Structure formats: C-alpha cells, structure tokens
Amino acid sequence: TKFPKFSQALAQDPATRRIWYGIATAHDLESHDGMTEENLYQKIFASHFGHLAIIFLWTSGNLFHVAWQGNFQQWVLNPLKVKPIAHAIWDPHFGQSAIKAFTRGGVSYPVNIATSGVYHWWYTVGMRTNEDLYFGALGLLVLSTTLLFAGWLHLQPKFRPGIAWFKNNESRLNHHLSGLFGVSSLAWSGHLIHVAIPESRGQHIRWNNFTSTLPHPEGLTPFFTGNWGLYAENPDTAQHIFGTSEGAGTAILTFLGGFHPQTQSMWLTDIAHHHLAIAVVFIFAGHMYRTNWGIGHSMKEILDAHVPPKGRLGAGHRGLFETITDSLHMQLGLALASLGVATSLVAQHMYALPSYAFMAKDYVTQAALYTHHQYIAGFLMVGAFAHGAIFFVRDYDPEVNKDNVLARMLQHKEAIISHLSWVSLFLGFHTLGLYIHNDVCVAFGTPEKQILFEPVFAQFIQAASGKALYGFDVLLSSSTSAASVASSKIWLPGWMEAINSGKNSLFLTIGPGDFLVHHAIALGLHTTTLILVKGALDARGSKLMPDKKDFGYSFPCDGPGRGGTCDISAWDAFYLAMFWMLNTISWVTFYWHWKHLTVWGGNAAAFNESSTYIMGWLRDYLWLNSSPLINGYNAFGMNAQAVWAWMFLFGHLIWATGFMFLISWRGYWQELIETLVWAHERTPIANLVKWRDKPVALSIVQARLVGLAHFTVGFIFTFAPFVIASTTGKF
Amino acid sequence: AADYPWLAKYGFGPTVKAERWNGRHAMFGWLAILGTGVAKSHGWLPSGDVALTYNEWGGLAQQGFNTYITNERAIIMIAHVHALAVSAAAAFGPQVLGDSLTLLDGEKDEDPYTPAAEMANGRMAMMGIIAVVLTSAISGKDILEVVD
Amino acid sequence: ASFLPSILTPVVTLVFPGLMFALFFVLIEQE
C-alpha cells in the first residue's frame, strides 16, 4: 500500500529514491509486480482512451479560448493585418507598463498573440464566428466525456476485452485502413465540399441548412451518371477573393494545382479531391486482410513465404509475425518511426505548400510550426530506436528468429556499426573541413578561395520538378518532354507558374551554403543513427559485456573492472543520441529560419553570401536577429517581447543546469548529503522535525535522465523564443 | 463514502457535520445578503463605480484589463477575506468548546436524518440561497433587486 | 465573463495544485 504498490521492491526501498523510481516506473506496465499479458493489454487500452480524451480536451480548450477571449471575428475581416489572439493574460505580477504593452490586437485587455496558426486553420476550414468555435469546443468536450466513460467501461469485468481480440491483427488493420483513414478522409472531403468551399465562396452553410443547400447546382446527378467532369467544370477564377462570391466558381473537385493567388494556399477544391481520392485508395486497401469471410490475406503466411531463393536473406521473414504480434515494443518502435517520418514530412510540406488561407504571409506561425514539427519528428525517431533497443533486450527470441532476416541484423551488426561510423566520420570530417576552409579564406580577406560546391543534383531535381532558372531544361522544365506534355491540362498550367514564381517557398533557390548545410544535416542524421543502431544491436551483449540482456535495458554500469563500463546499458545509447537529435534538428531549424528570414526580407544574397562560412551563421543569423529578442526589456523600458526575452534566458538557465547532472555524478552529492544529514540531525530545534525516507543522492540513471531533461527543455525554450520573437521584430 | 476513506475519516464529504457547517454558513450568508442590501440602500459603500488603480491595489486592481473592480468590491473583499482569516483560525486553531470542522478521530458523525432545529433552518437557508441565485440567473435581475 | 479569470485562475493554480501536492505527499507517506 506504500506508493509503489506495483513494485514491492521500491515499497521496501527506505530512501528517497523510492518516490523517484515509483513515479518513473509508473507507466512501465510490462515489468510491474503480478502483471499478466491480458491485464497489461487492458490497462494499455484504457490509458489510450484517457489519452485521446486529453487530446480532445486540449483541442476544445484552444477552441473555447479563441472563441471567448480571441479576436477571431475581427481577424476574419482583415486577416493580413489583425494579429490573432491566443488567450487573455491573468497575472497579478504585471505592472502598468507591461499592461499597456501586452494590451494589443484590438482588445482592451492584455493578450497573447497566437503563433499556432489555429486562426488560419479554422478560417480555411469554415469557421467565421465565435459561436461556431464555442460549439466545436462543446462538442469536443462531449467527445472527451464519452472517451473517459469508454475508458472506465473497458476495465469492467463483463466489458474487459480479451487477449485474442487484442492480437487480432487482420481485423484491426482492415478497420484502421478502411474506416479510420479511409472513411474519415471521405468525411473530411465531404466537409470541405459542403461547408468550406461554400464558405470560401460566400455561402453560410451550417447544421440548420446544410441539409437543404446543394453543394453543386447539378447535385448528385453527375456522380450517378458518371459525368464527373461536371464537378471540375467552372473552377475558381484567378481573380477570386477568399470569403466572397465575386470571382467564385461552382466546381467542387478540381486538380488545378499551384496556389490560390489571393491567399497563396492550395485550392480547397484540390484538397477536397485529394481527400476523396486518397480515401478511395485506403478503403480499398482496407479489404486486404482475412476477417471472418475467407477472402483476404494471412499476414503470417505472407511473412513465412517471403524468403528469397537459395537462402539469400537466411530464412527470410519467418518468425517476424510471431515476434511483432507478441512484442509490444516492436510495434511501438515501428509506430514511432513511421510517425516521426510523417511529422518530418508535414514539417517539410506545410511550408512549401501552404494549405491555410493567408498563412504564407504569417511568418511567425510558419517558423513556429516548422520548428515544432521537426523537433517532435526527432523525438519520435529517437523513441522508435529506443523501443527497438528495448525489444532487442527484452522481447527478442533467437529460437523463433533462427537464421531470420532480423537475426542477420545482429549477425552483421559489427559491419553495420563500423560502416555507420565510417560515413559519419567522412561526412563530419569533410563538412567541417570545407566550412573551416571557407571561414579562413573569408577571414584572410580573400573570399575567392572559398571551395563552393554547387548542389547540382538538388538543382537538377528542382529543374525536373519545374524550375527554370537553372537552365537544365530536363523533364518538366523542358516543355516538349513526355513528362511535361502528358500532364499539361490537369496541374502543370498552375504548378509551373507556382514553382517559377519567386514569391513562394516552393522549391527555394539553393546554393553552396545549401550544399554544405545539407551535408551537415546528413552528418547529424548518420551519427544519431549510429548511436541509436549501436545501442539497439549491442543491447543484448557486447565483447565487454556478453550478458547484458541479463541486466536488462537501463542499468547504471558493470563497475570499474575491465577498464570501466560507463554508459554501457543501451539506455545510455538513447541518452547520448538525444543530444545528437537535438543537434541535427537545431541545424535543420537554423537553416530553415535563416533562409526563410532572408527570403521573406527580400535579401537572399545574405544567405547565399554569408552561409558558406560559419561566422556568417554566427553573425547574420544569430547575432543580427537576436537584437529584437534581447531588447524585449532594457533599462529604458519594456516591449511585448519581454516575455520572449525572459523565456530565452529561462531556457538558457535550464540548458545550463542540465550540465550539472550531466557532468557531476553521484558520489560527490551522496557524501554532501551525508554532511547535510549530519547537520540536520545534530542541530537543535530542527532535529525534532525528521524525515521518513532517508535522503540520498540521485541514482546514476536518474541523474542522466534529469540532466538530459534540463538539456532538452532548455533547447526548446531558447529556440522557441528566438524563433518567435526575432521573426516578429523583423517583420 | 467508503471509496474515499481519507475524506470520510475527517467528515469531509456527504456527512452530517459538513451539512451542519454548510447550513450555518448559508444562514450567515443570507444574513450577509440582507445586510449588504440594506447597506447599499443606505450610504456605506463608496459610490460612483470608481475603478481601482495600480497605485492603490496594484496588479490585483486590473486597472487597464477590463472587469471594473470597484472600491465597494474591494471593501467587501477585505471583509470576506477577514472572514476567511478568522475561519482558518477557528478551524485549525483550538476548538473553543464548540464544533470541530473536522470530525476528529474519536467522534463519529451524528446520526443522519435545538441542533435539529439548526439543521432544519440550515437546509431552509441553503434552499433559499439556491433559489435566489437561480431566480437571478433566469430573470437576469440583480440578486439584491430580487430579494428586494 | 471577465469575472471568471479572477475566480478560476487562482483557484486552479494556487489552491488546487497545493491541495494535490498535499494529498500526494500524504498518500506516498502511508504505511
């Protein structure tokens, strides 16, 4: 009944580490005392329900706050000038000066200027009044209420799902593909065609009249006759103004491509057609697997048969079905890797192809969103690899994977790790050397000696996609090619203009700075992969510790014997690779932010000139753009960016405090706590007040965790401020 | 009740002691509404709807935010905060041979249904408070005008 | 209304989390 009820070992633990480790292993349900697989799965299911309810509550809170305290209605009239308000500020610590400064956005109270793009998203989606946002918040609140009740219900005795149902892979994948992806995307396309395109074209479609108003003048007669080109006929004109009927068409499903000229975002007809088609594909693919009707596929059979001839990949994929369906960590790793790749994809695609009206001219929101999603992508990738390592050290069965495609990975892990080391070494050596060459050459007053490699291959991709300033004249750039001619009446007439228009972030012009920074990004990705892959492959054992699987995933060490065994557990591989995830995402975000600040400000010949050397990054990006942030508050007064300056210094302080736990280790602090225990016990008066848990220094893995925590939170706070405040102060 | 042994131990929850204390507070509260109503009818509270300033009430004033915090509001706030201070003193401090807010270890909550007269009047006072708040909400009228 | 920030922000970010910290400490120091 003591705090770690799930772990009787921590229950008998008498020191203060009991509380730390109980909180830390609260959610490590697999290793809890007296745990069975069925109970584990049911608990995971209920926790998923609660988590979904949290997500929808967060969404409803954002919606309600913008409805109640935000200037959504005023912003709708003038999207490009009025600054969106996130929520009102309630702070008794604010002075009169801060009150006047934070009173902004055309309201009489202090407020926070939204940098999440929710205003643009909802305006594009079809929200026009605070009432719609409030009703959305109410409905999401009801949804979360139902999800919480469902989570409670699915732990009851008569309503507790079984392990066979949990492990029913075919039905789950069929339903997720067909309905969760497919029918939900179909629902979104229907929403667009019924509510968003009419609202963009100046029609108020809501629940009271969406049943009466026809999305298309012809109705479903074209859909049933098969003359679906009537839904593309009469597209929106280039003189269309978003939210008004002037210049508005009647088409509901088009493939115009490019961007809407006024809003510089893709056409809602194009997006509706996208979601409709993509759903067709997914609803088809959700009929792949066999579920209670004979017709379909058997995933175990597929994996078993996929073994190439003559044992090229050993025994092929035999046993992989069993390992994946038995081990939740492998499923978690696959999910995290896929979702991290998808997060990187959305980060790369939203800025290049904006979808929300007037987002492109909102420079702060774009940078905030890109940085946000790139960081989360990095975290998801690190988690995918960490859970792969946990699977290897906890759930991997060599008897099942005898001569398997997965076992051969462990078989030639030495080759894999050595070659990842080679490529990381080459990339870092050469990228750093070229950067230093450029640094010294510009330093010595002779920039002509800079070694500047043109990214010819990326430029060739841009030319093949439609760029023409490079003059390569290949594929779509060459109007005559089969690629350019076959698609010349669907999307190219708009895409060509969009890509060759220099006012867009679609396929930005690139140069030697882009070459060098891309090779740096390659170095970051390769080294992070090296650390993570090595951790995963050596989690089971090593020449320095062949029996590591007995110790498990996260243990402090093996002692000073055999030369020392620091950070050998393959959890410390994750903890090391987290630094590199932060490093490479920071490089990515610095590249994005500087190139986009230059492009938005209209001087791309600052990035093209200065980015070739590192002092250009240190001066024309960091030092130059740090002035509006650090000048948030000074001796003469304060501005509305004082919060960003304070949070900038805050992230610096946390990043610095992490170095304490990372550098100084447990013995010093343990002995110091012995001294403090002596003092407290020996002083009078205070010694009547006595602890219950014996105070001890933080454990080794605990302190590694705390130091990495302080590092990461620090990273994100510092760049968030610098990316949100410098953009605001420069535009 | 049983699922919440911690709060059930000290009378916190659906308990006769809690009902008694809340009935006493509802009695005093109806008294307070009548008293402040006659106070507004007479001249005690500052008039003019004068808003507070940062120079007198600081950031708790909310000078430039909105929400028109008034000097009458500040004075009644001081009064109710003094009530809350005496509350902490009486509850946590020594029970001056009266009633403990907490049940205490030895005592068991009185059997659920002059003390009974207090409880009947307290139920009536809670009902009156709820009825007045509702009537104000539906009518849109002020509470003091409703009781008037 | 503009009343509700004043009523709710301090109740929810001084009183409730202090009570939660008290409850968690008392619970983890049981038995």
Binding site: G50, T145 | - | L4
Partner: peptide, 30 residues
C-alpha cells in the same frame, strides 16, 4: 460574443468530464 450562460454550460460539461476522469483514473489505479 460568447455569453455567460454559454460559458457556464460549457463549464458544467467540463465538470461532468472531470468526474468521469476521476472515475477512469480510479479504475486504472485498481
């Protein structure tokens, strides 16, 4: 303009959700 009654209704639904959240936390704790 969101009304006082609207805010109060949303707050009531939020309180119902809170009660359900406590229940789900209990049932996950057992």
């Amino acid at each position: 303009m969101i009304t006082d009654s609207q805010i109060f209704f949303a707050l009531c639904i939020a309180l119902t959700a809170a009660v359900l959240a406590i229940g789900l936390g209990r049932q996950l704790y057992v």
